Design a protein around this ligand. Structure first.
Ligand SMILES: [Cl-]
Length: 129
């Protein structure tokens, strides 16, 4: 599913992402835009053989099981395919463990390089929240 911007903001707020670990909702919408373009079905292979899944491009190196990332962990205890569903519950709950891992939203390279320090509030401008 390809989310609309305010549709995704609404869904992320519902699942408790707004100001989770201090990151306002616009941070999460911006990261989703540059990670997946709001597409829950996005996948992308990393150079080490791991794969990023879903609207927040969660990495099978650490966080989910896809059966084909040999040295890896499954810290969210979830099959990576669950991160591709039209329902974002699994992605959000897993992203809460990632952002709590000590590095904040720097865990997402796209957030650091394209959202951090910008006017991330613009990403939720006009949304009924
Ligand atoms: Cl949802």
């Amino acid at each position: 599913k390809v989310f609309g911007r305010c549709e995704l903001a609404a869904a992320m707020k519902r699942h408790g992402l707004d100001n989770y670990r201090g990151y306002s909702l616009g941070n999460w919408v911006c990261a989703a835009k540059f990670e997946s373009n709001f597409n829950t079905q996005a996948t992308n292979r990393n150079t080490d053989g791991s794969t990023d899944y879903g609207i927040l491009q969660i990495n099978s190196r650490w966080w989910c099981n896809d059966g084909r990332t040999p040295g890896s962990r499954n810290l969210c205890n979830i099959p990576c395919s669950a991160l591709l569903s039209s329902d974002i519950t699994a992605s959000v709950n897993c992203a809460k463990k990632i952002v709590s891992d000590g590095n904040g939203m720097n865990a997402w390279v796209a957030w650091r390089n394209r959202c951090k320090g910008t006017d991330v509030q613009a990403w939720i401008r006009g949304c009924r929240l």
